[PDB]
Paper text:
pmcAlcohol dehydrogenases (ADHs EC 1.1.1.1) are NAD(P)H‐dependent medium‐chain oxidoreductases found in all kingdoms of life. These enzymes typically catalyse the reversible reduction of aldehydes or ketones to the corresponding alcohol. The structural motifs of ADHs are highly conserved in all known eukaryotic examples; most notably, a zinc ion involved in catalysis, a second zinc ion involved in maintaining protein structure, and the Rossmann peptide‐fold involved in cofactor binding. ADHs have been shown to catalyse many complex biochemical transformations in plant natural product biosynthesis, suggesting that their catalytic repertoire has been expanded.
Here we report the crystal structure of dihydroprecondylocarpine acetate synthase (DPAS), an ADH that catalyses the non‐canonical 1,4‐reduction of an α,β‐unsaturated iminium moiety. We report four crystal structures of apo‐ and substrate‐bound DPAS from two phylogenetically related species. These structures reveal, surprisingly, the loss of the catalytic zinc ion from the DPAS active site, indicating that zinc is not strictly required for reduction by ADHs. Despite the presence of NADP+ in DPAS crystallisation conditions, none of the solved structures had sufficient density to model the cofactor. Therefore, to assess the position of the bound substrate relative to the cofactor, NADPH was docked into the active site of DPAS co‐crystallised with the substrate precondylocarpine acetate. The 4‐pro‐R hydride of NADPH was measured to be 3.7 Å from C19 of the substrate which is consistent with hydride addition at this carbon. Additionally, the 4‐pro‐R hydride was 4.6 Å from C15, which is the site of the second reduction to form secodine, although we note that dehydrosecodine may bind in a different orientation within the substrate cavity. Although electron density for the structural zinc ion was clearly observed in all TiDPAS2 structures (the CrDPAS structure lacked electron density for this region), surprisingly, the substrate pocket lacked electron density at the expected site of the catalytic zinc. The lack of the catalytic zinc in DPAS is substantiated by the observation that two of the conserved catalytic zinc coordinating residues are mutated (His74Met and Cys168Ser). Computational estimation found TiDPAS2 had a larger substrate cavity than other structures of ADHs involved in monoterpene indole alkaloid (MIA) biosynthesis.
Residue numbers in the entry:
A (entry chain A), B (entry chain B): 5 to 362
Write the structure that this text describes.
């Protein structure tokens, strides 16, 4: 039984029946604190589109009962004997992944988010063979390598979506030189990831055009996020006028979409960075890719050193997500609103104040 | 009429009926020598898979009668007054493209193969509005910028496929750093482009594995081409054993094929360089691309300065294609054999000795 699996009792909300996707109160347990482990009392957990996709029963490989949530901000309540960088009582945050092989090139050179055996935030076995439970819970236990120090100047609630959506945008931009004034960057899709991509790029001095299928989002894009331009992707005149005008485009969409129009927007040798995870596959336009010498680049989150650097950057530049703070028993309705796009732009669950045992 | 369109008479073989793809003798004409033009008596024309794709009526944009062939080696018989770099009687070669806009960034910085208005080797209008006729003809006229000096020590017949297949492999490797010892390179498909990619990589000192669906090519791959290894892609054990072992893969296939297994062969941050142009669309597996931080990169031919550089490299390192020299009236049978992969590895038409007027 989940409550007997481990010595320390824990509780949260879980999808017990994968065919319905409904979360309900859930008792379970967490491993004892190892020598390099940190126990974290969870304060806030951001909700991302991957949580929704999991809840919609679209990831076969996940094990149920499923406790989702991978944007965790909390307080260290207990550290192992070998832990030194983090002290009890400190504000901390958890990476979007929980472990790596430790031996491959990526791990040894601190690029460990790209470990072939990276352990994702929930739903799969840990090193001890037990299924991981995510951030919609009262406490978690994480190896110290994957725990970050949360800046004092940063809102815990507004900073929580930085741990998956924020780092994905930040790393993709930093890794591919999309963080310098003079760059014209396009951001496709204005959801959680996209709205943070705009904020980070403005902080970098990058000129940003939001590329959207929702014309009512223009005002939010320009007035609230500070984008330099808004491109309605169904406007053939707007699209043709922007041909060859982008150095790079960051694609955040979780649905199937045509890639060829996006490649046409890029100048020769431009980059299309894919950070969204459509559940269905995409079609590759070979001729536009070849004739333009263009690149399709995948990116996923960021390494833990890059994540700490991002958190410090966000604190100094006051970069937070635009959030709605919700109680945990609102989670099923929030999932519906997230499915309809009725959120600007992130749900964050107040775990400390609204979660109680079953 | 094609013979009256221009002042100078010419002849070759053309697809007159695009629905059959059958070539037959064809009379036409070519423009007078402009100030910057070079008239070229064609000696040899390599046959590439794009010629086959054109004769199979798979490129809607091409105009007919269609004279294909874009791997031309010849002799300069006449130069414009302003031409200085090439003298009459010199052995020359033609780039796989015939013109560019001349104004964009790529043109002015000698990256003109990626000009958005590049004029391909045949079947589309030239600057004067007339359809271009390719290398399956007795002579051609080319602006001097797109004419190369052919090394004396290089076989004209064996060197002819360097002008499209050779430059595509060479440029893709040079542009993305796949030309240095220490790199483990995969070459998918052992056709015209693939077999030249192996030869160039061996000359660079790169370790090369040939990835093929035809096990009977193993001996030529290892003994004749000098590949370090041969991977049968339908052997699931062999494929699983090579997971994460490739720094980069060059995909030369002209047919639709699964790309996710190739992404699995790459290490994290690896590159899949696409140089083949399948007529039907390919499927992009986002999750493998996202998981590894991997790249899909398109590349097309090379710029003319790089082409001259490639030709000189081939002369000093004795790089030629493995060819069957054929007479022009064999072209329809050669297309059938090329369609079936029954050639090791390139057809080259002997134009000077076997082409006669209708
Ligand atoms: C930052 C979160 C995203 C979410 N999606 C879908 C794939 C995915 C990831 N975690 C998940 C948890 C539950 C269900 C699906 C996923 C993740 C985690 O990032 C890592 C491990 O470094 C990934 O890479 O899975 C290997 C990335 C990639 C894009
Ligand atoms: C060099 C190898 C060809 C073959 N294919 C198919 C596309 C193609 C090209 N020429 C053609 C002629 C007749 C029919 C189709 C084509 C070309 C030429 O390269 C250039 C202009 O620089 C290209 O890029 O077309 C923009 C490349 C790209 C890959
Ligand atoms: Zn590893
Ligand atoms: Zn140009």
């Amino acid at each position: 039984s989940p409550e007997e699996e481990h010595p320390v009792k824990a509780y949260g909300w879980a999808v017990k029946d994968r065919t319905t996707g409904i979360l309900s109160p859930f008792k379970f347990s967490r491993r004892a604190t190892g020598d390099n482990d940190i126990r974290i009392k969870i304060l806030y957990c951001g909700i991302c589109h991957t949580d929704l996709t999991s809840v919609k029963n679209e990831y076969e490989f996940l094990s149920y009962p499923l406790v989702p949530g991978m944007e965790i901000v909390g307080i260290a309540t207990e550290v192992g004997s070998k832990v030194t960088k983090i002290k009890v009582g400190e504000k901390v945050a958890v990476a979007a992944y929980l472990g790596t092989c430790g031996k491959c090139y990526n791990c040894v050179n601190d690029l460990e988010n790209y470990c072939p055996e990276v352990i994702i935030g929930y739903g799969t076995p840990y090193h001890d063979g037990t299924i991981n439970y995510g951030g919609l819970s009262n406490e978690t236990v994480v190896n110290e390598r994957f725990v970050l120090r949360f800046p004092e100047k940063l809102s815990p609630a507004g900073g929580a979506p930085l741990l998956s959506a924020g780092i994905t945008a930040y790393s993709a931009m930093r890794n591919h030189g999309l963080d310098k004034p003079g760059i014209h960057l396009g951001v496709v899709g204005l959801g959680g990831l996209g709205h943070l991509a705009v904020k980070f790029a403005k902080a970098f001095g990058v000129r940003v055009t939001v590329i959207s299928t929702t014309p009512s989002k223009k005002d939010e894009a320009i007035n609230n996020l500070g984008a330099d331009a808004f491109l309605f992707s169904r406007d053939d005149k707007q699209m043709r006028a922007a041909i060859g005008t982008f150095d790079a485009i960051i694609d955040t969409l979780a649905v199937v979409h045509p890639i060829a129009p996006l490649l046409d927007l890029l100048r020769s040798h431009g980059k299309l960075v894919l950070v969204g995870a459509p559940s269905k596959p995409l079609e590759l336009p070979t001729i536009p890719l070849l004739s333009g010498g263009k690149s399709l680049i995948g990116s996923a989150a960021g390494n833990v050193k890059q994540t700490q650097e991002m958190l410090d950057f966000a604190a100094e530049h006051d970069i937070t997500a635009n959030i709605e703070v919700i109680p945990i028993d609102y989670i099923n309705t929030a999932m519906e609103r997230l499915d309809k796009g009725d959120i600007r732009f992130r749900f964050v669950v107040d775990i400390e104040n609204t979660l109680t045992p079953p």
